[PDB]
Ligand binder design. Sequence first.
Ligand SMILES: OC[C@H]1O[C@@H](O[C@H]2[C@H](O)[C@@H](O)[C@H](O[C@@H]3[C@@H](O)[C@@H](O)O[C@H](CO)[C@H]3O)O[C@@H]2CO)[C@H](O)[C@@H](O)[C@@H]1O
Ligand SMILES: [Ca+2]
Length: 250
Amino acid sequence: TAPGNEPMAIPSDYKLVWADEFNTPGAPDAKKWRYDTSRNKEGWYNNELQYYAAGRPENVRVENGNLVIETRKERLTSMADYGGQEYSSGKLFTQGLADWQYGYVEVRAKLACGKGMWPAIWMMASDGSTGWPALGSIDIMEMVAWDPTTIHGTIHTKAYNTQKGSRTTAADPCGQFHTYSLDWTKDRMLIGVDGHAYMRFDNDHKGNHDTWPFDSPQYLILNVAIGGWGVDAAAFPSKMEVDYVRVYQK
Ligand SMILES: OC[C@H]1O[C@@H](O[C@H]2[C@H](O)[C@@H](O)[C@H](O[C@@H]3[C@@H](O)[C@@H](O)O[C@H](CO)[C@H]3O)O[C@@H]2CO)[C@H](O)[C@@H](O)[C@@H]1O
Ligand SMILES: [Ca+2]
């Protein structure tokens, strides 16, 4: 419903303004990522089945130049925020550490596969005041591992949820790295894989928050949900590998 078909590349007049190359093995860098544990006791949205474990290397660890977000079948019943979940996973975001208004975002990633796995790379507005989905949301990459070659790119607004999205295919996305990218300006968003936009969403320039809520900063989110849109017990453990995040601006 938001088709695109054009090349995408880091413009020559843009600079790298922030990156996690994941050069440093161990815990993610607390200056760049926080853990989101906020709905662990209550259960996450979308009828999701995962517990998101914070400072737990079995779920979130930097290893051989990659962020590793790993889902496991275990019950983390010793955690004070445990919510009876049958699976653990990771969710990191830049919320309250780094956000961006416009930019070329590049995430190079090998995905987490298995029926139930729902790896994502997505953004939400730092200003949450208008609520969901009015605040505006950008899914650079969504995949559901019962359809594991298909890459989804979508935006969420008050007027559109009407959802504006598109899809493409990539070669063994869980067994090789691709670059999932967003090119966001005041005029439009492209979302692509490997230098090709398969998704285009234009600003109608009508100054209407319901249709263009993207004249304000967004933060970035990395996670593997389990269930919802994504359960094969044999598929665990499974992991998303992020080689780098790079953000460029004029
Ligand atoms: O249900 C009302 C609550 O919504 C919270 O927002 C959630 C929303 O409910 C949920 O459907 C949604 O899920 C995401 C998809 O929209 C898409 O962006 O891809 C994501 C990654 O796969 C997926 O998680 O996420 C929203 C944000 O957590 C509100 O935050 C809450 O205030 C409200 O009561
Ligand atoms: Ca790296």
